[PDB]
C-alpha cells in the first residue's frame, strides 16, 4: 500500500532515497536518439562514404 | 501512534534525515490507514516555512526542526504522494515550492519535465528545461 | 572490553577514512571504464552547491 501511490521516478524504493543518475541516468530511458547518440553514427557513415571513394578512385 | 509521532517530531534530534525519515513513516502509516490526504497534509506542514527560507540545513546551529524545509527527501516523498493523489495543479505547485527553496536537482528538473510531458504539456517541458539550464549554466 | 578500548572519536575518523577510500576506489573505478567521473557528479547536484562552485 505504501508502494502503490508514487510515481517512482525520483524516489528508490528500496533505498528509500533520491534516486541518482551515477548509476541510473534518465538518459537511458528515452526513446528516442539524444545528443550523446547522435554525432555518432554520421561521422561514422562520413567515415565509411570516405573509405568507399577511396576504395572507388583506387 | 500519532501522539508519539508527535512528541518524536518536536524532540530536536541531532541529524534531520532523522527527523524526516519519522515524517515519512508517520505519512506511510496514514496511507496505510487509508488517510493518504492526511499523509499529504502532514508532509506539507513537515516542510513549512517562509517563501523565502534561506537556512542552511547543513549549519550546526539551529534545530533539525527549523532546518528541515530545505529536506530533499521529504520534499520528494511528498511530491511522490502527491502526484498519485491530486491534479497536475498540486504537482506544479509543489515543484514551485520545491524551486522557491533552490533544492531542486536536474534530475528533479528532468522530472519536472517528465510530468509535464505525461500530462500533453510540451511547452511546460521547454519551459523547465530552461529553467534547469539557467539554474546551473556550464557543467550541470 | 573491546568498545571501551575505541573512542568515539576514533571510530568517525575511521569511518571518514572509509568514506574517503570508497570514493577514491569508485572514482578510479569511473576512471578506468572510461566514464567520467565529474560528469557523474554534475548529475545530481543541488542549485546551491552549484552557485557555490561557480
Ligand atoms: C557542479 N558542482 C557543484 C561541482 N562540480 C565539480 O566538478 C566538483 C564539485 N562541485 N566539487 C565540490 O567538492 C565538494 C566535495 O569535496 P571533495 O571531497 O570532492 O574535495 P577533494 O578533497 O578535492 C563537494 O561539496 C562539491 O561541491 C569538486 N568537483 C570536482
Do not use: C
Not at chain 3, 23 to 52: C, P, Q, S
Amino acid at each position: 500500500p505504501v508502494l502503490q501511490h508514487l510515481s517512482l521516478r525520483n524516489y528508490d524504493p528500496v533505498t528509500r532515497g533520491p534516486k541518482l543518475g551515477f548509476e541510473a541516468p534518465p538518459t537511458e530511458n528515452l526513446n528516442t536518439l539524444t545528443l550523446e547518440e547522435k554525432a555518432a553514427a554520421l561521422e561514422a557513415e562520413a567515415r565509411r562514404k570516405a573509405q568507399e571513394e577511396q576504395e572507388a578512385a583506387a | 501512534a500519532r501522539i508519539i509521532m508527535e512528541k518524536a517530531v518536536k524532540v530536536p534530534f541531532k541529524s534531520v534525515n532523522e527527523l524526516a525519515d519519522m515524517w515519512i513513516e508517520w505519512a506511510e502509516m496514514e496511507l496505510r490507514n487509508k488517510n493518504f490526504d492526511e499523509a499529504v497534509r502532514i508532509m506539507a506542514k513537515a516542510t513549512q516555512a517562509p517563501k523565502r527560507s534561506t537556512v542552511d540545513y547543513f549549519d550546526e546551529s539551529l534545530s533539525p526542526q527549523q532546518r528541515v524545509h530545505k529536506s530533499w527527501k521529504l520534499w520528494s516523498f511528498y511530491v511522490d504522494l502527491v502526484e498519485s493523489t491530486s491534479s497536475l495543479e498540486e504537482t506544479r505547485k509543489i515543484y514551485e515550492r520545491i524551486f522557491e527553496l533552490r533544492i531542486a536537482t536536474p534530475q528533479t528538473v528532468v522530472n519536472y519535465a517528465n510530468l509535464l510531458e505525461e500530462h500533453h504539456y510540451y511547452e511546460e517541458s521547454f519551459k523547465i528545461y530552461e529553467r534547469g539550464l539557467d539554474l546551473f549554466s556550464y557543467p550541470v | 572490553s573491546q568498545r571501551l578500548a575505541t573512542d568515539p572519536s576514533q571510530l568517525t575518523a575511521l569511518s571518514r577514512k572509509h568514506a574517503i577510500a570508497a570514493h577514491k576506489l569508485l572514482k578510479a573505478e569511473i576512471e578506468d571504464a572510461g566514464g567520467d567521473f565529474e560528469r557523474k557528479r554534475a548529475w545530481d547536484w543541488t542549485v546551491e552547491e552549484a552557485e557555490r562552485w561557480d
